[PDB]
Design an enzyme around this catalytic site. Structure first.
Site, PDB file in Angstrom:
ATOM      1  N   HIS A  66      20.314  -9.130  -1.512  1.00  0.00           N
ATOM      2  CA  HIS A  66      20.886  -8.779  -0.159  1.00  0.00           C
ATOM      3  C   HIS A  66      21.619  -9.948   0.459  1.00  0.00           C
ATOM      4  O   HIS A  66      22.619  -9.728   1.176  1.00  0.00           O
ATOM      5  CB  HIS A  66      19.780  -8.351   0.798  1.00  0.00           C
ATOM      6  CG  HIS A  66      18.854  -7.299   0.236  1.00  0.00           C
ATOM      7  ND1 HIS A  66      19.304  -6.091  -0.227  1.00  0.00           N
ATOM      8  CD2 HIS A  66      17.507  -7.263   0.134  1.00  0.00           C
ATOM      9  CE1 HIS A  66      18.278  -5.352  -0.639  1.00  0.00           C
ATOM     10  NE2 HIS A  66      17.177  -6.032  -0.421  1.00  0.00           N
ATOM     11  N   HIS A 113      19.276 -17.441   6.366  1.00  0.00           N
ATOM     12  CA  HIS A 113      20.186 -16.725   5.480  1.00  0.00           C
ATOM     13  C   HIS A 113      21.443 -16.439   6.246  1.00  0.00           C
ATOM     14  O   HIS A 113      21.547 -16.758   7.436  1.00  0.00           O
ATOM     15  CB  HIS A 113      19.600 -15.407   4.968  1.00  0.00           C
ATOM     16  CG  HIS A 113      19.302 -14.440   6.078  1.00  0.00           C
ATOM     17  ND1 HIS A 113      18.167 -14.498   6.850  1.00  0.00           N
ATOM     18  CD2 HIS A 113      20.097 -13.527   6.688  1.00  0.00           C
ATOM     19  CE1 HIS A 113      18.222 -13.606   7.815  1.00  0.00           C
ATOM     20  NE2 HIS A 113      19.378 -13.015   7.732  1.00  0.00           N
ATOM     21  N   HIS A 133      25.022 -13.600   6.605  1.00  0.00           N
ATOM     22  CA  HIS A 133      25.772 -12.390   6.332  1.00  0.00           C
ATOM     23  C   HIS A 133      27.247 -12.775   6.353  1.00  0.00           C
ATOM     24  O   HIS A 133      27.648 -13.635   7.170  1.00  0.00           O
ATOM     25  CB  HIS A 133      25.509 -11.307   7.358  1.00  0.00           C
ATOM     26  CG  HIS A 133      24.039 -11.063   7.594  1.00  0.00           C
ATOM     27  ND1 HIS A 133      23.373 -10.001   7.026  1.00  0.00           N
ATOM     28  CD2 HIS A 133      23.140 -11.770   8.291  1.00  0.00           C
ATOM     29  CE1 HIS A 133      22.109 -10.022   7.455  1.00  0.00           C
ATOM     30  NE2 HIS A 133      21.945 -11.134   8.158  1.00  0.00           N
ATOM     31  N   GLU A 154      27.551  -9.991  11.989  1.00  0.00           N
ATOM     32  CA  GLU A 154      26.829  -8.813  12.493  1.00  0.00           C
ATOM     33  C   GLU A 154      27.027  -8.630  13.999  1.00  0.00           C
ATOM     34  O   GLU A 154      27.514  -7.574  14.420  1.00  0.00           O
ATOM     35  CB  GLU A 154      25.330  -8.967  12.158  1.00  0.00           C
ATOM     36  CG  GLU A 154      25.076  -9.181  10.621  1.00  0.00           C
ATOM     37  CD  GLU A 154      23.781  -8.628  10.163  1.00  0.00           C
ATOM     38  OE1 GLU A 154      22.752  -9.135  10.573  1.00  0.00           O
ATOM     39  OE2 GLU A 154      23.841  -7.640   9.410  1.00  0.00           O
ATOM     40  N   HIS A 196      21.545 -16.818  10.314  1.00  0.00           N
ATOM     41  CA  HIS A 196      20.336 -16.421  10.978  1.00  0.00           C
ATOM     42  C   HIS A 196      19.199 -17.309  10.548  1.00  0.00           C
ATOM     43  O   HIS A 196      18.793 -17.340   9.356  1.00  0.00           O
ATOM     44  CB  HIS A 196      19.974 -14.960  10.569  1.00  0.00           C
ATOM     45  CG  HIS A 196      20.934 -13.967  11.168  1.00  0.00           C
ATOM     46  ND1 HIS A 196      21.167 -12.680  10.683  1.00  0.00           N
ATOM     47  CD2 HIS A 196      21.778 -14.113  12.202  1.00  0.00           C
ATOM     48  CE1 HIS A 196      22.062 -12.094  11.440  1.00  0.00           C
ATOM     49  NE2 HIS A 196      22.392 -12.906  12.400  1.00  0.00           N
ATOM     50  N   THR A 246      18.102  -6.489  11.170  1.00  0.00           N
ATOM     51  CA  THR A 246      19.379  -5.856  10.852  1.00  0.00           C
ATOM     52  C   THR A 246      19.496  -5.271   9.453  1.00  0.00           C
ATOM     53  O   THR A 246      20.546  -4.737   9.063  1.00  0.00           O
ATOM     54  CB  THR A 246      20.548  -6.811  11.022  1.00  0.00           C
ATOM     55  OG1 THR A 246      20.424  -7.875  10.077  1.00  0.00           O
ATOM     56  CG2 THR A 246      20.623  -7.382  12.448  1.00  0.00           C
ATOM     57  N   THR A 247      18.381  -5.297   8.729  1.00  0.00           N
ATOM     58  CA  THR A 247      18.225  -4.582   7.446  1.00  0.00           C
ATOM     59  C   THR A 247      16.925  -3.782   7.551  1.00  0.00           C
ATOM     60  O   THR A 247      16.016  -4.099   8.320  1.00  0.00           O
ATOM     61  CB  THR A 247      18.047  -5.532   6.245  1.00  0.00           C
ATOM     62  OG1 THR A 247      16.906  -6.392   6.401  1.00  0.00           O
ATOM     63  CG2 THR A 247      19.258  -6.349   5.988  1.00  0.00           C
TER      64      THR A 247
END
Ligand SMILES: Clc1ccc(OCc2nn[n-]n2)cc1Cl
Ligand SMILES: [Zn+2]
Length: 258
Positions: free
Chosen positions: A62, A92, A94, A104, A117, A196-197
């Protein structure tokens, strides 16, 4: 559960397995800078990362994730909207397929190239898995990335990515200093939201810094060479691993700054 970011298994599908996807405090959101209000009640934000102990970097299919020793109060986030002490467990990112998308959170509908994040859990709940079951269990510090000058404190991360190209790969990642990833200003917006996942739990106090950090095009291009798939599987480039903005509903976003 076979959720991901493709057409067939992406954010628009998640609600069928995780109905909290359509809940009342989902993340991310658009931050409308003209509706957010300065809150003089917010105490100063305290980012205490001097004793942070990084362990390992993992591609989980992911994102890539840098994990820390969170068995003691070594790297903590306090102050701002937070009551008590939140322990850094991991960070991590995105990111996008192109420089104009990837974050995001958005700011007046602006998308950044990526979003960092830093994930912390409330130590009154004793472990991470208990904390995610609480409305004040996590604090996620979010930092936008824009493409410009290189960020030297990111390059140790970029340089290790070719060793964790595929899902399930990990590498030792000691002695990394996450302070190198912060902007100069800790001015922020805050609101109550969610992961958010999947499982999309409504357990997060969001703290989103106003000032982005600049990374180079070459640095973000290396993010985009990672793979969502496992070794020996058809290559699917790890890009566009972001959830789009969700309805604000009955929430207020507060600013730390005038
Ligand atoms: Cl440990 C951890 C790792 C990744 C992750 O990705 C989704 C996300 N990002 N910000 N909130 N949720 C959430 C968690 Cl809790
Ligand atoms: Zn995240």
């Amino acid at each position: 559960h076979h959720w991901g970011y493709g057409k067939h298994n992406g954010p628009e599908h998640w609600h069928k397995d995780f109905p909290i996807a359509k809940g009342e405090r989902q993340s991310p959101v658009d931050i409308d800078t003209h509706t957010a209000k300065y809150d003089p009640s917010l105490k100063p934000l305290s980012v205490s990362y001097d004793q942070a102990t990084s362990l390992r970097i993992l591609n989980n299919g992911h994102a890539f994730n840098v994990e820390f020793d969170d068995s003691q109060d070594k790297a903590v986030l306090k102050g701002g909207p937070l009551d008590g002490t939140y322990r850094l467990i991991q960070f991590h990112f995105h990111w996008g397929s192109l420089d104009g998308q990837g974050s995001e959170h958005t700011v007046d509908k602006k998308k950044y190239a990526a979003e960092l994040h830093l994930v912390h859990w409330n130590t009154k709940y004793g472990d991470f898995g208990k904390a995610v079951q609480q409305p004040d269990g996590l604090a996620v510090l979010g930092i936008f990335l824009k493409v410009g000058s290189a960020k030297p404190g990111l390059q140790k991360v970029v340089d290790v990515l070719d060793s964790i190209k595929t899902k399930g790969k990990s590498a030792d990642f000691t002695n990394f200093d996450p302070r190198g990833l912060l902007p100069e200003s800790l001015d922020y917006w805050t609101y109550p939201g969610s992961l958010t996942t999947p499982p999309l739990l409504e357990c997060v106090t969001w703290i989103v810094l106003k000032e982005p950090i600049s990374v180079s095009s070459e640095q973000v291009l290396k993010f985009r060479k990672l793979n969502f798939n496992g070794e020996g599987e058809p290559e699917e480039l790890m890009v566009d691993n972001w959830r789009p903005a969700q309805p604000l509903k009955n929430r207020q976003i507060k600013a730390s700054f005038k």
